[PDB]
Nucleic acid binder design. Structure first.
Lengths: 164, 147, 131, 97
RNA sequence: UAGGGGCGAAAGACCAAUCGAACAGUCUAGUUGCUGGUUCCCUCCGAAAUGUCUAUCAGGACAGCGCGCACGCAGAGAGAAG
RNA sequence: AUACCACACACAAGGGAUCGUUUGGCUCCUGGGACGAGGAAGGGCGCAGCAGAGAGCGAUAUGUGUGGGAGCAGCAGCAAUGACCACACGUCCCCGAAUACAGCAUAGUGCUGGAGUACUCCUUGGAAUUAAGCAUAUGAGUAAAGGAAGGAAAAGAAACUAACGAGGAUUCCCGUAGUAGCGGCGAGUGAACAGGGAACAGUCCAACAGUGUAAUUCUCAAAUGAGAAGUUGUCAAAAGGAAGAAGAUGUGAAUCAGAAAGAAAAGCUGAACGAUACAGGGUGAUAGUCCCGUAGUGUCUUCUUACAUACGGUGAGUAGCUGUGCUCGGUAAUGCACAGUGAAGAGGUGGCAGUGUGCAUCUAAGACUAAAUACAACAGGAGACCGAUAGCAAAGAAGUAGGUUGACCGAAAACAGUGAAAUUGUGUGUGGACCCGAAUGGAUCGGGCCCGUCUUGAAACACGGACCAAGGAGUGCACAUACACUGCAAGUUGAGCAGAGGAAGUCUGUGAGGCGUAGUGAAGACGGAAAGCAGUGUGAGUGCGACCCGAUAGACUUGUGAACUAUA
């Protein structure tokens, strides 16, 4: 060892070490596409994905950002006038482990349930939908965006009374 | 340049491959890795790496990065967070801008330089230096502490 | 262009498939064109050459000659035609074999099952032609 | 390095939420009461049929001589936990009374 | 009766032309500061065998002497005169 | 130098390089993952008209049925009264788990054993090597040896994280991170939550079953009886379907002629014609139209999948403690064991030992679970891969010929092409080891010790080299780095993954993280200079076989040997 370098630390001593290559990457992508397509036929009029709640992220670093969670709580579902068995039949996800501890978090998730209920359409048989030429929705349902906001201006008299 | 021939291709026909006839090219003449550092390699360490052989400082057996992560901005850069089209409106306009550093991922404000435009501004952050507070109050602005 | 990915385009694979063929696939190798008149007398465009049929040689040393098929060598893919031969130093004469595709049929040998073979092929066409 | 810039005072701040009160579960139904009664009853019969174990006898003997601190040390070494020892002493005391 | 084991009227003798620790195969491409070798042409520049520390004395590292790329630029392996 | 020795050229010998060719290898991707007491895998022996090896098959050693249809490769004989092929079935000698056996369950019938083990789970457990020595440590919970299962296996629905304004089973990918820490604080080792995605699903037993009648399971009879299990506790409900996928197979356009020349035209020259088909293969030289296909189109056969009852809050030699041994990044104990000791019904946890007390979050000591993930044999498709001293050891009867007492060990050989050099004979010329400089009709003149290599120093009485051909040694990846070149710039980026698209290419989104935009201290705490990010390559350091070849040795096996020789 000669000259000036950051002192080495390269961990290749272990003779039993395995290597993983990724030559299969394009092909496995094509298989995942073809499985989704055929799954989408089996339940034609219905979306492939279920509806999920909006929750707030964990640490001090991510407090100001909202995200999708696992499932609605029994309290959210009941407040919007539904019952658990019905919610499942209509493609809403459920999570009985989660607890509610805020007024705000509850109010927002109730809005999602009422919005979704309003945008639905019901059919007697598959053939009726087929004849009406209904086109099935793809991707996640009503996802959050979390954009950067815009700079508001305020009059000099307000400065004393509200502080942004 | 984007491509160039290698040195190995010029050394064809020359006996020692550039390692010398007397010194040669052997397997490991000095030892393996970064070993020998208190002994025969002491001169390399004392010249380039003097604070290597030591123990130092307070110990916490588990730390959390998310609970301690922060990013800092100076007063001279506050107006720069706004878009250039936005800057050019508030410069002439009668209104006062309300800038929230949390929205750009900044949490602490430092007192470096002078403010870009000498008119009032409202600045929202988690912590301010003493110099920063004095500079903002000098122009008739306001500092608002928030979580 | 080929869009079916189950069929091979390898030179190595196509060649092995040729020379190691057996059964009905071997019979396909012995096909020859019919003359313009016979293609009105019968529906078929090409048939496997058999002994006793009458052929015009259209390429090679024996070009323009006509004659009766004497023998069909399946292992070494060649046909022997009456009066196409070479003479040795001894004066002895040996029939020289011609590759099927260098021949053209002028009259069909209708011995045995030939009439049923032809019927079977004509029906197979119409079945899909008329649909 | 983007670490260790704020003071501990400013890290302790928090956003002003509106809370929801906890739903208390104090009511205990008739059938739940009988269930608990029968379990406590069964625990009596075992003690009546089979009696006390050797260290329980030795412990109770020390309590009669007012050897409180000896009994404490003894029980700690038998059960491991100083909490279990404090509980078992209180149960044994009540049995003797 | 079988390998860190046998068997010995004792020589470290003998155990399939092998014994002061058998044979086969694997870990294993074990390690080597030591010996041998290391494959085309022309053009231009050009050394060292000394100092300090080293379980160091057939080896290293740091400095000194080469070359390449070069921001820039009043200097010099010689004399006078105090 | 008549004939010996050397060199040059022509011819004949001798050998198999070079160039042209390839029904083989290798690598990546996709499918598949199918054995045995109904006798497997592996071994032996027989069967043909002339038959050794290999292939195929069992004393039925080319039999039956279905779909097709022309010959059986040599010689003699057979064949529309079916040559030959393809799909299924029937027959299937002896040894071998090898069994007329062993262990075990039921009212009874039975089940296990051996083979395979790349990938997955459970045990047991090294040394070479690195530290420039070596003993803790490293290599490594790796190799080796044992047990077991499936097409995957394991895991799995919190006695879970976190301290936020919180989240919410398991597995996998990007990332936190070569970080917090462990360490003769040396060499070296080394995780977790978050944040962005793929795929998504939850449920059972015990505690706790009608008492105006065991209502429950099984057997024989019978059309309504006998008997077995069981009160040490039996018994807690639906048919049902069209979709989805993979194979097999049918059809399928359009050309003739000519001078010269050749063994032969498909070349070349003129005139035509097809295309939703100009992928590729075969024909006596380079073919869209000569043959097999291809684009486009028909049929048929298999496989996969789907509705009912009743419930909660106490699962013990356990959790824990003391001593002890191994283990982990886990540090005054991370996990697992053994011996002593041993709870409560209420207990467990909140990465630093103890005692107290509020607060937050969970419920151990019983069970089941899809999808997203891993990789041999065997089958199919591709390639900036190799081209007979290469590529698998093996392009032919290759794990073969042949060999070890044994465990085990193991080759060569392509075309009836071309036909180099070493080396030999004959003929013709020129010289007496040969090279460089300069010449004659002709004797010759001048200069030169044998190369490669270590070395102060080689022609050496220093070592390697008889001769020719072919093969034969600084490479790949990871991490920091300086330089040259390129885009944008207070910013920058092909993370994974989604959408489009006859597709391992390309285009477009969503969207983390990282580094930079300013530093100082062990830290509490404080704050005031300096263009960067991502690539394409070159020099150079470190770790892996690491420029190529080379020890004496060390360890591990449910591997072998007393045919020589020792002793009973």
């Amino acid at each position: 060892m000669r000259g000036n370098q950051m002192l080495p630390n390269n961990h290749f001593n272990k003779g039993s070490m395995k290597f993983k290559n990724w030559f299969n990457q394009p092909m496995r992508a094509l298989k995942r596409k073809e499985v989704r397509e055929q799954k989408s036929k089996i339940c034609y009029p219905n979306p492939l994905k279920k509806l999920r709640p909006v929750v707030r992220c964990c640490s001090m670093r991510y407090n100001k950002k909202v995200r999708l969670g696992r499932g609605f709580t029994k309290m959210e579902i009941e407040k919007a006038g539904m019952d658990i068995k019905y919610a499942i039949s209509v493609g809403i996800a459920v999570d009985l482990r989660r607890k509610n501890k805020n007024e705000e978090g509850l109010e927002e998730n109730v809005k999602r349930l009422m919005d979704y209920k309003n945008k639905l359409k019901f059919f007697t048989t598959v053939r009726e939908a087929r004849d009406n030429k209904i086109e099935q929705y793809k991707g996640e349902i009503m996802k959050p965006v979390n954009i950067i906001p815009e700079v508001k201006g305020i009059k000099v008299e307000e400065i004393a009374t509200i502080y942004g | 340049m984007f491509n160039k021939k290698s040195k190995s291709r010029k050394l064809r026909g020359h006996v020692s491959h550039g390692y010398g006839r007397v010194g040669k090219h052997r397997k490991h003449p000095a030892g393996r890795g970064k070993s020998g550092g208190l002994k025969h390699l002491r001169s390399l360490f004392q010249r380039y790496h003097p604070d290597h052989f030591r123990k130092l400082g307070i110990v916490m057996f588990h730390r959390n990065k998310n609970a301690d992560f922060t990013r800092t901005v100076n007063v001279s850069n506050l107006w720069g967070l706004m878009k250039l089209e936005e800057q050019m409106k508030f410069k002439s306009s009668a209104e006062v801008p309300v800038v929230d550093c949390r929205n750009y991922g900044y949490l602490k404000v430092l007192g470096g330089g002078d403010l870009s435009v000498k008119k009032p501004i409202v600045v929202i952050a988690r912590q301010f230096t003493k110099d920063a507070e004095e500079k903002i109050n000098a122009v008739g602005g306001k500092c608002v502490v928030a979580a | 262009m080929k869009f079916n990915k189950n069929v091979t385009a390898s030179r190595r694979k196509n060649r092995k498939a040729h020379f190691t063929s057996i059964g009905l696939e071997r019979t396909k190798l012995m096909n020859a064109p019919l003359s313009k008149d016979l293609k009105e007398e019968y529906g078929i465009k090409r048939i496997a050459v058999r002994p006793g049929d009458m052929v015009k040689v259209v390429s090679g040393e024996f070009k323009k000659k006509e004659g009766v098929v004497m023998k069909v060598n399946r292992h070494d893919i060649k046909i022997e035609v009456e009066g196409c031969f070479v003479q040795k130093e001894d004066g002895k004469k040996i029939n020289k074999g011609i590759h099927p595709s260098n021949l053209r049929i002028i009259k069909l040998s209708m011995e045995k099952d030939r009439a049923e073979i032809i019927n079977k092929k004509v029906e197979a066409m119409k079945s899909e032609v008329k649909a | 390095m983007k670490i260790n810039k704020l003071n501990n005072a400013s890290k302790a701040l928090s956003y002003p939420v509106k809370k929801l009160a906890k739903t208390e579960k104090a009511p205990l139904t008739e059938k739940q009461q009988r269930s608990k009664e029968l379990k406590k009853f069964a625990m009596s019969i075992a003690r009546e049929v089979g009696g006390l174990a050797p260290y329980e006898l030795r412990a109770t003997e020390l309590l009669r001589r007012d050897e409180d601190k000896r009994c404490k040390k003894f029980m700690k070494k038998r059960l491991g936990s100083l909490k279990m020892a404090k509980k078992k002493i209180e149960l044994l005391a009540e049995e003797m009374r």
